[PDB]
Ligand binder design. Sequence first.
Ligand SMILES: Nc1ncnc2c1ncn2[C@@H]1O[C@H](COP(=O)(O)CP(=O)(O)OP(=O)(O)O)[C@@H](O)[C@H]1O
Ligand SMILES: Nc1ncnc2c1ncn2[C@@H]1O[C@H](COP(=O)(O)CP(=O)(O)OP(=O)(O)O)[C@@H](O)[C@H]1O
Ligand SMILES: Nc1ncnc2c1ncn2[C@@H]1O[C@H](COP(=O)(O)CP(=O)(O)OP(=O)(O)O)[C@@H](O)[C@H]1O
Ligand SMILES: Nc1ncnc2c1ncn2[C@@H]1O[C@H](COP(=O)(O)CP(=O)(O)OP(=O)(O)O)[C@@H](O)[C@H]1O
Ligand SMILES: NC(=O)c1ccc[n+]([C@@H]2O[C@H](COP(=O)(O)O)[C@@H](O)[C@H]2O)c1
Ligand SMILES: NC(=O)c1ccc[n+]([C@@H]2O[C@H](COP(=O)(O)O)[C@@H](O)[C@H]2O)c1
Ligand SMILES: NC(=O)c1ccc[n+]([C@@H]2O[C@H](COP(=O)(O)O)[C@@H](O)[C@H]2O)c1
Ligand SMILES: NC(=O)c1ccc[n+]([C@@H]2O[C@H](COP(=O)(O)O)[C@@H](O)[C@H]2O)c1
Lengths: 212, 212, 212, 212
Amino acid sequence: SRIPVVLLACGSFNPITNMHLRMFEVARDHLHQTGMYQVIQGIISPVNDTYGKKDLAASHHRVAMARLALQTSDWIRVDPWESEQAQWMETVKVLRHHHSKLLAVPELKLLCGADVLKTFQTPNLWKDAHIQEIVEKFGLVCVGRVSHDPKGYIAESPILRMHQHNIHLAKEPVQNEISATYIRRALGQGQSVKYLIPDAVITYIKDHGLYT
Amino acid sequence: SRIPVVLLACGSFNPITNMHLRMFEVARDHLHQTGMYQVIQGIISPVNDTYGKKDLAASHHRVAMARLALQTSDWIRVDPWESEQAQWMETVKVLRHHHSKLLAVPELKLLCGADVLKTFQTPNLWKDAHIQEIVEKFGLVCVGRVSHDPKGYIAESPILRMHQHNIHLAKEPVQNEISATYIRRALGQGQSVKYLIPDAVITYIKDHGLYT
Amino acid sequence: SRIPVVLLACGSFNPITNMHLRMFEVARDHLHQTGMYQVIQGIISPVNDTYGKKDLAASHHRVAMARLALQTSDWIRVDPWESEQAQWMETVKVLRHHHSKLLRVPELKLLCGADVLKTFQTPNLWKDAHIQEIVEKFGLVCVGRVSHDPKGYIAESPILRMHQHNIHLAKEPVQNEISATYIRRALGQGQSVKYLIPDAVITYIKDHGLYT
Amino acid sequence: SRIPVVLLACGSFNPITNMHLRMFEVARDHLHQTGMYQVIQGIISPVNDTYGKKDLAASHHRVAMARLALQTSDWIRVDPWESEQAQWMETVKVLRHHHSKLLRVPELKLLCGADVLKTFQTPNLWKDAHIQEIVEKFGLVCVGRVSHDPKGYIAESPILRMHQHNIHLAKEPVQNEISATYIRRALGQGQSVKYLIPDAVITYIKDHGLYT
Ligand SMILES: Nc1ncnc2c1ncn2[C@@H]1O[C@H](COP(=O)(O)CP(=O)(O)OP(=O)(O)O)[C@@H](O)[C@H]1O
Ligand SMILES: Nc1ncnc2c1ncn2[C@@H]1O[C@H](COP(=O)(O)CP(=O)(O)OP(=O)(O)O)[C@@H](O)[C@H]1O
Ligand SMILES: Nc1ncnc2c1ncn2[C@@H]1O[C@H](COP(=O)(O)CP(=O)(O)OP(=O)(O)O)[C@@H](O)[C@H]1O
Ligand SMILES: Nc1ncnc2c1ncn2[C@@H]1O[C@H](COP(=O)(O)CP(=O)(O)OP(=O)(O)O)[C@@H](O)[C@H]1O
Ligand SMILES: NC(=O)c1ccc[n+]([C@@H]2O[C@H](COP(=O)(O)O)[C@@H](O)[C@H]2O)c1
Ligand SMILES: NC(=O)c1ccc[n+]([C@@H]2O[C@H](COP(=O)(O)O)[C@@H](O)[C@H]2O)c1
Ligand SMILES: NC(=O)c1ccc[n+]([C@@H]2O[C@H](COP(=O)(O)O)[C@@H](O)[C@H]2O)c1
Ligand SMILES: NC(=O)c1ccc[n+]([C@@H]2O[C@H](COP(=O)(O)O)[C@@H](O)[C@H]2O)c1
């Protein structure tokens, strides 16, 4: 039988976009195509507001937009736990929490874009022990992104190389590089972002005057 | 006052995708940013089935998918006229028809991707007299596409160069090259295309067993 | 033993660029990795001047630039035959001519980008009989390009899908979308195109006042 | 009269590629088109070997390749100072050193791709004081890259948006996303990278057995 799997996506989702959502679908199909996995659930976990960030909309709104975006999904849900904590928590800790939650046990994997993988190389950004635990105890499902070479990042990292069987590279012959940064600026300029992010999310942004 | 404008998009829409729809939004914002136009409507006109094509799903289905995709749009509608004709009609004729329909009169412009513009250079593809009438009597709103240089196509074409004031180049700093061809193959392989095309279109394709 | 292969690329090469050149290298590495072939030579064949077209520099200029571009190549060369003919010639006929030369035996395959492959669908652009001869008698090596889905073009063409064993899809993991149209416009504006096309081609362009 | 400018690019240049080089040309053409400047020289400054990093070839090798790459450049040169220092140095400090050299006056601006600009947000990666000195004392010229929205990074950074007059966004109309990570992996697999990086750099790599 196929190993059951839960995909966990950490990040800003400021706001959640069609590409963030597309990421989950590509990862699930890739894992199923291997013939040894069955993805049973996806989790969108918005980052805590304390994460010293450019400036994110309040997490209350980011969780809301994700919930609304996921209404038409029968397997992906938002989980506010991470954003409800008194403060920012390292990713490996969110994985531990959601793993405990799950506790015949499905494997919990971190779903991210290849760019995140490139950041593992940034000095002080990630603790080597976290990089190791993330790839060894949980797993990584990385979706391709233009300009990044996931296979090379893996080969050049002693830690990732050693646990590469637990890293799954997925990529669809599509080219969709819509950045939430662009989305925010377009919204701020009164321009349309329709068809770049869900209609339900555009409605919420309009109703609550976000990204002005 | 701003000149009123109707955007007409001709093509396969086999099936209509988020990018086809995105094209309309980018064009409208570009025309409004000029300060001299007010886009009052968009028309999606699926190509007749007789158009000797690879093989398109029946036009009945393509019109349906467009209608469903456009349910959440308050300014874009599908018009089956072109596909209901006994046979394929040159684009300039569809423009004339929709122009007559409109008949204090708004300008009707052909909305297309920069790749279509590149095809004007293909021998026998378009009649020079049609290329001229299309750009002179109606107008062109072209949305950028990776790999194409619209400005160069215009400069190297005596006809387009002469009527370049009637060609409007729009492009959003986004990279979305999802091809309907890829969509069809993904569907045929049982893979997800969710978030690449509208949920309402995926539902119809599933219910009617299309693209198998 | 490996099947000896010769790759032929037809196109305007107006001017030849680094992507044109990259195409040969990618196609060769791909054929070699199959293990069934051994590419022994590449041939750049500039189209004839009568090819009812845009802003096409005189053929001898395009042959000379390709030649300068190829000086650092140990296996690729430009063959002026096609451009030196009196009139334009369908591509199958260029494939027959070079097939003849090969006999004063290596397999002669047509090398092109995915965009060319999509043109096989354009009404009346190619004779079905020619598309068949190309992939049945000779062979087709296609390099990926952004926005194109080669596998889908092949599956949807009743002619191509029957000859899949002779069609090789070479994947381009590097986003390298340089447009010659862009190259020409930039030059005409006095902007740099260095590192986009060969240094010697740039010098030649300048010395002969091309693309102004 | 025009303000004399010197462009400084810091990075690993491991190895230097055609996109790295293209970056200088694009930035120069952009500064010149403003009319307020006249770029008099470009400087490639390879990072020091102690830069806690990946698979970094010895600095003298990276300086030599950059030098071979720059032989056909009449205005760009590599300066080994940074790599020849004893330890790694924050970029502002490299900007001060070269600012000093300039005085044995030209404006010294930091040249980088949009992706670098997005890293100014990464927690603790850059000192706010340094980001300020960079765009207040010196200046920043940024070349566009796929998936990045520079205008948005600038607007959302309270530091950057205050110094917009010293930040220049150079647009790259050519999709040229070459990854050095990819270059290295391809080489290690014995695949060609010709036309992606300079011929002489390839020769040097081979002669010194780099990236195997
Ligand atoms: N277009 C895309 N394709 C593939 N993955 C993407 C993607 N856009 C975002 N992602 C991934 O989605 C996850 C969350 O992204 P975010 O934290 O929202 C940064 P972003 O989406 O780039 O917006 P930004 O502009 O605020 O940085 C990350 O793993 C990121 O790699
Ligand atoms: N991703 C994209 N970005 C901008 N324009 C696009 C686009 N995809 C399609 N278009 C435009 O939408 C119009 C209709 O396209 P279609 O006739 O459906 C061809 P297509 O969308 O490329 O699907 P295909 O794979 O069947 O060729 C054309 O003007 C085309 O240029
Ligand atoms: N950037 C690129 N990547 C992959 N293939 C490319 C390419 N640019 C051109 N080609 C391929 O090179 C061959 C000849 O191309 P050309 O006839 O010169 C069209 P082009 O290079 O786009 O110039 P154009 O814009 O003047 O038409 C074709 O097979 C084409 O697909
Ligand atoms: N393809 C590209 N287009 C535009 N800028 C690029 C580029 N590739 C690299 N650069 C720029 O060149 C400078 C130095 O880059 P490097 O430090 O070598 C990272 P890289 O080139 O991506 O190699 P890497 O994959 O080993 O990290 C940076 O400003 C970077 O943005
Ligand atoms: N060391 C860590 O655990 C670590 C470091 C950087 C980013 N992250 C996470 O990655 C996601 C995206 O972060 P960025 O916005 O910095 O790219 C967030 O959920 C963030 O918490 C975790
Ligand atoms: N000469 C003409 O009027 C002409 C030529 C080619 C395509 N078209 C139109 O462009 C749209 C897309 O055509 P393709 O599927 O061939 O790219 C269709 O609506 C088609 O009718 C019109
Ligand atoms: N019917 C045919 O054999 C046919 C049709 C179109 C293009 N071609 C060739 O393929 C290349 C296409 O170049 P363009 O797309 O710039 O016209 C040229 O070499 C051209 O000669 C051949
Ligand atoms: N805080 C700083 O001054 C700082 C931080 C990160 C990178 N850098 C520099 O910018 C370039 C970045 O290279 P990488 O992204 O490969 O680390 C290097 O030259 C590096 O030295 C400087």
